[PDB]
UniProtKB/Swiss-Prot annotation:
Monomer in solution; Homodimer and oligomer in the presence of negatively charged lipids forming a pore with a size ranging between 20 and 30 Angstroms. This is Cytotoxin 6. Keywords: Cardiotoxin, Cytolysis, Disulfide bond, Hemolysis, Membrane, Secreted, Signal, Target cell membrane, Target membrane, Toxin. One of its GO terms (cellular component) is membrane. GO terms for biological process: killing of cells of another organism. GO terms for molecular function: toxin activity. The chain holds residues 22 to 81 of 81 of the full protein. It comes from Naja atra (Chinese cobra).
Amino acid sequence: LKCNQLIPPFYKTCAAGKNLCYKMFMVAAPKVPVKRGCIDVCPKSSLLVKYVCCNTDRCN
């Protein structure tokens, strides 16, 4: 799996174990992403942090 990330080259091949891509948002600023990359499990969202995860190359 390959996921998009904020730092160049803007994408990265996930190590074994990480089969999900994710994007993290901070409330009162959804338009702007805070973190993007590979992950093992989709973190639970809260009132202050939101997570969106997908499982195909560069889907995040």
